[PDB]
Amino acid sequence: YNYLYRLFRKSNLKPFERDISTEIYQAGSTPCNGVGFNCYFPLQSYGFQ
């Protein structure tokens, strides 16, 4: 689980853009206020086996 990729972003990356941000992603129409369901942490792992 040491390897990671970004699952969500509010806009596409530009060419050779790099982004370390871990701010919560509002997937629904209802605001997240920095904290869950439809309010997702944006980095996930392949869990390689």
Partner: protein, 50 residues
């Protein structure tokens, strides 16, 4: 669950935003598609397995 009931949807308009915005569900997940993109798409059939 051995006899799982399938609905086939055809010739109809299917909203997923009522499904993903609803607080009712203890889990919601998607594979091969973004959940935010679903409402823009069109398909020959849609299936719901229950």
């Amino acid at each position: 669950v051995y006899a799982w009931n399938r609905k086939r949807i055809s010739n109809c308009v299917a909203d997923y935003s009522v499904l993903y915005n609803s607080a009712s569900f203890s889990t919601f997940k998607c594979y091969g598609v973004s959940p935010t993109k679903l409402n823009d798409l069109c398909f020959t059939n849609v299936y719901a397995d229950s």
